Amino acid sequence: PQITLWKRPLVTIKIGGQLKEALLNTGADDTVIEEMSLPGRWKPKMIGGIGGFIKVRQYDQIIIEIAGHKAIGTVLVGPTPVNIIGRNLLTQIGATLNF
């Protein structure tokens, strides 16, 4: 699709068997989802931006379906205000910014 930017670019995702809404965020290095269970081992991480830092769990090799496009990568889980799809998964679905 071509997504204009008049409104927040929200899409439906499927992760861990759950449907969620998430923000396509070219300003995020990483993908960050609100609290949920995921399989495998994890390690703690601190991630920052406006307002400072939050602590998250880092899970590797997680499959995600983003607006119908499957991708695999690292997913961070923690107390984010909004579910965020970052560049690590945007690249995998072929997303580009065009102007």
Place this chain on the structure above:
Amino acid sequence: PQITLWKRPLVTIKIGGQLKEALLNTGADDTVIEEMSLPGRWKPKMIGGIGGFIKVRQYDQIIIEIAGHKAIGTVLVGPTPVNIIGRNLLTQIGATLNF
């Protein structure tokens, strides 16, 4: 241009006759720049990010060039970690997300 997302989507901007680097950010409603001087009156604004909320100064109708494209619009100034070009100005330069 077409900007891929394997690296951060950093571009050169010009504001107040000075060149700066900024992040093209689909996950930002607004454009937020690190401390600098801008002309005119400002109004207060609270904005939120991953870590919480910060206060910024809102300046209206500021001339800004983004990657060679001229925009005139609202610029927020405050303690952002990184200069970000948000959707208010991405729409002025005709940017879209495509996959």
